[PDB]
Short mmCIF file of N, CA, C and O in Angstrom, two decimals:
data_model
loop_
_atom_site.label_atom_id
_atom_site.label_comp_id
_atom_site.label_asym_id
_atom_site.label_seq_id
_atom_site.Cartn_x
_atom_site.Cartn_y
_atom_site.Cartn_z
N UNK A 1 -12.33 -2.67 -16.33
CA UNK A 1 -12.13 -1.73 -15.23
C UNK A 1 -11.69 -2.45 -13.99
O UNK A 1 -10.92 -2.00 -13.14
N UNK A 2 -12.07 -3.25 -14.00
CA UNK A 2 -12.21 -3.98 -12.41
C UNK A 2 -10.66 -4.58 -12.84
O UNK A 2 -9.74 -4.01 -12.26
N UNK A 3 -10.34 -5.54 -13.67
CA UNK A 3 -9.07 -6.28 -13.94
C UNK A 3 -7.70 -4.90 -14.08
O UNK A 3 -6.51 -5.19 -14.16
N UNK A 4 -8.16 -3.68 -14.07
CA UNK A 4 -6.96 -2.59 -14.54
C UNK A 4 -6.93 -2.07 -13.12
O UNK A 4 -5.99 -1.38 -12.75
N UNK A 5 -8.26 -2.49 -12.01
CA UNK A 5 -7.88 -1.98 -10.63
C UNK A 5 -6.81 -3.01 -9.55
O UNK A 5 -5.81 -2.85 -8.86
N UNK A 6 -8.00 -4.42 -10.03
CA UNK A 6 -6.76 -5.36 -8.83
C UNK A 6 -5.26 -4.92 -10.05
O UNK A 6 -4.38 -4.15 -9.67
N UNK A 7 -5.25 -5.29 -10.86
CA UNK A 7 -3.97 -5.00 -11.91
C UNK A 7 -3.13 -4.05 -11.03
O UNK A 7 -2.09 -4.51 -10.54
N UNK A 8 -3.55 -2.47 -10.71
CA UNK A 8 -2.70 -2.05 -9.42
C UNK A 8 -2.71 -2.13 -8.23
O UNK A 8 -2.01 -1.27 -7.71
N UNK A 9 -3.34 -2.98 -7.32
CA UNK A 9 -3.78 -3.20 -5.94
C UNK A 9 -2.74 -4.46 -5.94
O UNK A 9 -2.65 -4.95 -4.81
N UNK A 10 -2.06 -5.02 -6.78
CA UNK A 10 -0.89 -5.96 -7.07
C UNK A 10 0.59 -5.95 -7.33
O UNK A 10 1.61 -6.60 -7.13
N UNK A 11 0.11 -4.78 -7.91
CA UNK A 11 1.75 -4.23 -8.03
C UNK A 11 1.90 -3.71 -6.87
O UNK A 11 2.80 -4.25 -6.23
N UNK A 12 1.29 -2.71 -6.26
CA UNK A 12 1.33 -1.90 -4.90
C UNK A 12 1.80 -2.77 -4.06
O UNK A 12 2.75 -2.54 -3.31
N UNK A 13 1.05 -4.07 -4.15
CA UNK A 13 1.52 -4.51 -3.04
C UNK A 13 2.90 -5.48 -3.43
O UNK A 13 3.54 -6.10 -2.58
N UNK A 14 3.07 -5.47 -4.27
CA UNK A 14 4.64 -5.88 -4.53
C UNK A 14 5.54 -5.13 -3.55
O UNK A 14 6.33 -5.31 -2.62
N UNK A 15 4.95 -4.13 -4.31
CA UNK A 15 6.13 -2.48 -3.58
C UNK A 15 6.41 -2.63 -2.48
O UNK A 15 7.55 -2.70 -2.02
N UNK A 16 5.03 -2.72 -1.69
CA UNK A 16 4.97 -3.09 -0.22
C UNK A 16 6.15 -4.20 0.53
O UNK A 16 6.90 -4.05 1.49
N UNK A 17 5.99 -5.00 -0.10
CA UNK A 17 6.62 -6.79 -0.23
C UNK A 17 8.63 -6.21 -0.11
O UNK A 17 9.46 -6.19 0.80
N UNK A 18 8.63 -5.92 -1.24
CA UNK A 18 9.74 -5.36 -1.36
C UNK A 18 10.76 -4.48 -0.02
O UNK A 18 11.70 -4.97 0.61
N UNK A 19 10.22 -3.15 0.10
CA UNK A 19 10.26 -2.27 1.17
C UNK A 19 10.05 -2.91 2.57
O UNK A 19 10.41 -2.23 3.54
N UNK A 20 9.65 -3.80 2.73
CA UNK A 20 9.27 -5.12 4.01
C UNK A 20 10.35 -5.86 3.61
O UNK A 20 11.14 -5.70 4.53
N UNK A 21 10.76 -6.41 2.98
CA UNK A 21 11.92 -7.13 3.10
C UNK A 21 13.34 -6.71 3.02
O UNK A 21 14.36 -7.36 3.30
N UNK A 22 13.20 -5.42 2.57
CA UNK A 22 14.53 -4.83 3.29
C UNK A 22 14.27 -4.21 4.92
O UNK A 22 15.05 -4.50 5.82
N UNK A 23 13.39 -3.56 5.09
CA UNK A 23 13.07 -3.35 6.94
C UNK A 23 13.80 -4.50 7.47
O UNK A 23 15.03 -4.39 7.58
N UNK A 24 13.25 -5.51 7.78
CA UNK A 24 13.21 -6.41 8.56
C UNK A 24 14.70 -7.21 8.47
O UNK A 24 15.06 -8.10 9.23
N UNK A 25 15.47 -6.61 7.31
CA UNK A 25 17.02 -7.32 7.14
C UNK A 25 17.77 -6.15 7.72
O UNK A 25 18.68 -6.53 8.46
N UNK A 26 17.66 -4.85 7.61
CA UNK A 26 18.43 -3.81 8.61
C UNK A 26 17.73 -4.50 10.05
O UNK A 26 18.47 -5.21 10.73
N UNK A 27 16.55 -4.32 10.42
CA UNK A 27 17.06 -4.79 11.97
C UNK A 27 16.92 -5.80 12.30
O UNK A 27 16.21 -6.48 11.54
N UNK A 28 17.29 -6.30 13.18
CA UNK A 28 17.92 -7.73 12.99
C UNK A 28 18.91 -8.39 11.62
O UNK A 28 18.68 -9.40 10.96
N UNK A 29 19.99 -7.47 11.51
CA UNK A 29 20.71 -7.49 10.05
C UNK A 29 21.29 -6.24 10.01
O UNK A 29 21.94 -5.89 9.03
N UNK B 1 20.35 6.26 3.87
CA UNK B 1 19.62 4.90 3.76
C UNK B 1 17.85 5.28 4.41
O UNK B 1 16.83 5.19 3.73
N UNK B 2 17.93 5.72 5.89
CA UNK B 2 16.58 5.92 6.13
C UNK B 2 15.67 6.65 5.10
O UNK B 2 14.72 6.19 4.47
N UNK B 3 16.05 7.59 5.10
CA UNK B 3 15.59 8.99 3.61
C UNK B 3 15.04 8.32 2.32
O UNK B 3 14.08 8.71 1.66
N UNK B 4 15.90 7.15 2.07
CA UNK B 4 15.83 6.57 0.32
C UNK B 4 14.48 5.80 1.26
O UNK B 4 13.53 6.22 0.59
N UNK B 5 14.01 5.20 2.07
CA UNK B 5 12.86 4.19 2.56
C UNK B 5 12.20 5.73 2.58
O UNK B 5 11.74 6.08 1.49
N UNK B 6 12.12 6.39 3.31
CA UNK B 6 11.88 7.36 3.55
C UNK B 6 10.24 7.80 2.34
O UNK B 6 9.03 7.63 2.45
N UNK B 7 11.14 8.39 1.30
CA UNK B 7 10.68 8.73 0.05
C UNK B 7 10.11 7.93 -0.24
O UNK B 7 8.95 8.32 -0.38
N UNK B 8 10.25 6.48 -0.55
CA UNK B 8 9.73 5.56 -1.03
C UNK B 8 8.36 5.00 -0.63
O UNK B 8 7.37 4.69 -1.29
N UNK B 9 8.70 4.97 0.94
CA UNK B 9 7.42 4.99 1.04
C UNK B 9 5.99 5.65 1.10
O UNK B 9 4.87 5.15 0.96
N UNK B 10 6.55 7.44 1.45
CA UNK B 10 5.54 8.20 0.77
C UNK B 10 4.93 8.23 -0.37
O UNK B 10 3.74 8.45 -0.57
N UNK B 11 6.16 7.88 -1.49
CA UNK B 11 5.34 7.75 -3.13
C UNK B 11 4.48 6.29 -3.27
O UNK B 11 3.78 6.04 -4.26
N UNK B 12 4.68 5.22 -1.92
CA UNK B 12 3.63 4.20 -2.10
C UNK B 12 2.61 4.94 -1.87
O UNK B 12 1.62 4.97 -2.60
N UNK B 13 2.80 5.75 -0.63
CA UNK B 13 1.51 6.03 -0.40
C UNK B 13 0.58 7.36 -1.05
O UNK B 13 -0.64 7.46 -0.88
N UNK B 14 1.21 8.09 -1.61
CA UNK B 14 0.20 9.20 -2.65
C UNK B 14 -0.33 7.94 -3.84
O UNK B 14 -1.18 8.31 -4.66
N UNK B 15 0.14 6.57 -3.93
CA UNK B 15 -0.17 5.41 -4.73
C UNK B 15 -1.78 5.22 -4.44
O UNK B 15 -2.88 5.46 -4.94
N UNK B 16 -1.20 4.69 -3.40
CA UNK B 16 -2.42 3.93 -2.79
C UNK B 16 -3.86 5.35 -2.42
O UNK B 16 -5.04 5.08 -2.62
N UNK B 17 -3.48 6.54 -1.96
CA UNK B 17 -4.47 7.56 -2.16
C UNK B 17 -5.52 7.38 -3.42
O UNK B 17 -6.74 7.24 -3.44
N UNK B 18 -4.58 7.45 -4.43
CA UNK B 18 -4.92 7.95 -5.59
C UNK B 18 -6.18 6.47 -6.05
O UNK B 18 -7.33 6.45 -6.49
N UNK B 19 -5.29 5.53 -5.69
CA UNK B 19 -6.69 4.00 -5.52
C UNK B 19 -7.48 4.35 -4.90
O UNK B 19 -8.59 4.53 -5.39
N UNK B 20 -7.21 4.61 -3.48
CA UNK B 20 -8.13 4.98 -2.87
C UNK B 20 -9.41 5.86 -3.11
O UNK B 20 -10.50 5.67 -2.57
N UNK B 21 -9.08 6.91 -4.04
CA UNK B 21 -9.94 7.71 -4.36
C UNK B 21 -10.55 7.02 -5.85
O UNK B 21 -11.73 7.37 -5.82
N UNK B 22 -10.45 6.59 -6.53
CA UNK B 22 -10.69 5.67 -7.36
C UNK B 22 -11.98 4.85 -7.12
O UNK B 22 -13.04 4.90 -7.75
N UNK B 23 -11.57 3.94 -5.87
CA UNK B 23 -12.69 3.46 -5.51
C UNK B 23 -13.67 3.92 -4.79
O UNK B 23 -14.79 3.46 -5.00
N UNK B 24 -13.51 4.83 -3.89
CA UNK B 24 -14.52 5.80 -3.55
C UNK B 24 -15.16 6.40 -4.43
O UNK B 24 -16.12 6.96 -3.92
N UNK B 25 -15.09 6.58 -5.70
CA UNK B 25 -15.61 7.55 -6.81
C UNK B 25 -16.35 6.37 -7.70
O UNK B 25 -17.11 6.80 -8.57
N UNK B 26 -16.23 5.11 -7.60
CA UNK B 26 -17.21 4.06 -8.48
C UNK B 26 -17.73 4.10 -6.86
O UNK B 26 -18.83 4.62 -6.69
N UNK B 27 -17.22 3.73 -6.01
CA UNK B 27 -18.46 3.24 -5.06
C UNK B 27 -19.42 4.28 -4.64
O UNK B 27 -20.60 4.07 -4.36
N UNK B 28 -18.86 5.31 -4.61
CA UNK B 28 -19.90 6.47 -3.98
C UNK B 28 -20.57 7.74 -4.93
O UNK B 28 -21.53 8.43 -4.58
N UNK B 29 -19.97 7.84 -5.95
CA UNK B 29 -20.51 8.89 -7.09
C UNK B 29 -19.75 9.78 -8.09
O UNK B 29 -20.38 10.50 -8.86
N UNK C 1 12.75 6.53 14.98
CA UNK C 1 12.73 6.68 13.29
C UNK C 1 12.41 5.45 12.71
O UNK C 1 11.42 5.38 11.98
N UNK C 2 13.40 4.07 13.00
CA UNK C 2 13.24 3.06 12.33
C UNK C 2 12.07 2.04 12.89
O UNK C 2 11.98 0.95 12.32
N UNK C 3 11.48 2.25 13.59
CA UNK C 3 10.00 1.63 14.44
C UNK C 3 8.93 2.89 13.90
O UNK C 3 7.77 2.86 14.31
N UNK C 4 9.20 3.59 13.31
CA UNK C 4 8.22 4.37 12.79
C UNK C 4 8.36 3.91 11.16
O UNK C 4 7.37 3.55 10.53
N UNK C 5 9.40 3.95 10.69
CA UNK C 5 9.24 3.61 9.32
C UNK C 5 8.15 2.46 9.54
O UNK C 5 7.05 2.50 8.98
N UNK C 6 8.55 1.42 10.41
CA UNK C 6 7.76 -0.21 10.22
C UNK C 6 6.31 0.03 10.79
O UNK C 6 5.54 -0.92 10.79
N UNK C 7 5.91 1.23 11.28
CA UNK C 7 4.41 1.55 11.91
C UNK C 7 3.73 2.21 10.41
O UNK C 7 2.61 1.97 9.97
N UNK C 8 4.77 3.08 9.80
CA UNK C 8 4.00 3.33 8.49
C UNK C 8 4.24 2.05 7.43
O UNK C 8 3.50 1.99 6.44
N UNK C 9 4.90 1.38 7.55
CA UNK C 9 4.45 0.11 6.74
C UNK C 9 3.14 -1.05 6.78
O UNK C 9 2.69 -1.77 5.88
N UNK C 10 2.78 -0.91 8.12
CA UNK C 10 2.01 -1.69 8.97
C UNK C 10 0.80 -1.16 8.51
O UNK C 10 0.01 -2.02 8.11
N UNK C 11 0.47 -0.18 8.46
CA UNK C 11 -0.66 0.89 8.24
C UNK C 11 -0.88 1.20 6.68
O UNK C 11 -2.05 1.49 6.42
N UNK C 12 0.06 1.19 5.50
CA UNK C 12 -0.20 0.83 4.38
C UNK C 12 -0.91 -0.27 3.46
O UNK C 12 -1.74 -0.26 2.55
N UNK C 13 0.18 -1.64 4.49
CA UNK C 13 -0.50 -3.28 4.17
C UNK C 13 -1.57 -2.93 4.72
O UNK C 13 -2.44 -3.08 3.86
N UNK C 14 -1.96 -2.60 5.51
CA UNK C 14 -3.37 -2.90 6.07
C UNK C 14 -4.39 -2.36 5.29
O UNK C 14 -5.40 -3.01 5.01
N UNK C 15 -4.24 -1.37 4.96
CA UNK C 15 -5.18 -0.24 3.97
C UNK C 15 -5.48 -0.87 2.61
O UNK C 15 -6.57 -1.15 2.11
N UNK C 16 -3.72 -1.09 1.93
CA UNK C 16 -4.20 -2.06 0.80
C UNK C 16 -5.34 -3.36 1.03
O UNK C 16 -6.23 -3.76 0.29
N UNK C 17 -4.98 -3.71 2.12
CA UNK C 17 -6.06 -4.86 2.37
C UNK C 17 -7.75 -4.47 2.31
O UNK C 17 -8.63 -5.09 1.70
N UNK C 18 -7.90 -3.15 3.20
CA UNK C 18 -8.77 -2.43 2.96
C UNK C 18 -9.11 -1.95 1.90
O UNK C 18 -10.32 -1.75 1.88
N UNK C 19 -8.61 -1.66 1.02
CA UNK C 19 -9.35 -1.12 -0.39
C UNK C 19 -9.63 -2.21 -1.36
O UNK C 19 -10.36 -2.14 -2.35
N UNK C 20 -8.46 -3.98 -0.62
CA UNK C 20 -8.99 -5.10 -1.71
C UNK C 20 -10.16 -5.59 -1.48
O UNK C 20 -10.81 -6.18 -2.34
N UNK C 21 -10.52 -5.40 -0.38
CA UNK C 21 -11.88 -6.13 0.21
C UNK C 21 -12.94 -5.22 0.06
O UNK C 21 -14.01 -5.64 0.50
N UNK C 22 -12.97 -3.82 -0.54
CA UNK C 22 -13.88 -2.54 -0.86
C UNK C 22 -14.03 -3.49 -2.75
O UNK C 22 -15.06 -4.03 -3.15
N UNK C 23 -12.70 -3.41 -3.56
CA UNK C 23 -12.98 -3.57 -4.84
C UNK C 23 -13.80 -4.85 -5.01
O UNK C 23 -14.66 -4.95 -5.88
N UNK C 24 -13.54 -5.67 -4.26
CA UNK C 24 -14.59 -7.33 -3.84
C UNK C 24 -15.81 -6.91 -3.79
O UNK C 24 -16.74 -7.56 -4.26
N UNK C 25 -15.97 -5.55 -3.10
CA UNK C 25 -17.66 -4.93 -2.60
C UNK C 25 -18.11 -4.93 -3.80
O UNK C 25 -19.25 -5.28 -4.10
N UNK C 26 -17.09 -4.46 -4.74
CA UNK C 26 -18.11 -3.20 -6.06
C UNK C 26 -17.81 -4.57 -6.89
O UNK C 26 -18.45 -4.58 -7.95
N UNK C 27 -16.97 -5.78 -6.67
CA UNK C 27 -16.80 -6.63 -7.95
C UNK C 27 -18.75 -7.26 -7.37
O UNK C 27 -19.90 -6.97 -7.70
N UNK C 28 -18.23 -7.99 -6.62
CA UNK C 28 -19.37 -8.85 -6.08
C UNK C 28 -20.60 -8.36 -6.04
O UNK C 28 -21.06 -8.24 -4.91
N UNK C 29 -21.35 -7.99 -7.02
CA UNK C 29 -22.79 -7.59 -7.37
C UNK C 29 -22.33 -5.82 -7.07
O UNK C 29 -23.16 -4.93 -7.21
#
């Protein structure tokens, strides 16, 4: 249970990661 | 372009709800 | 618009952070 929760609290924050690194290249970019 | 971030980041976030409620429901009952 | 997209990004990371340090609660005893 616990390994199938961080398991998505990791990907999420991929997502996050992702969507942040295009922001920050439109401005300033 | 804004719209496609737009979307995207709402469906992170009904994501992260849905964790959210997850762990509220082992931690609280 | 685009300083709001990055205020709802700001407020997501943070939350994820918040729910990793909640699943730490329920891992850790």
């Amino acid at each position: 249970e616990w390994e199938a929760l961080e398991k998505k609290l990791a990907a999420l924050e991929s997502k996050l990661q992702a969507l942040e690194k295009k922001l920050e290249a439109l401005e300033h970019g």
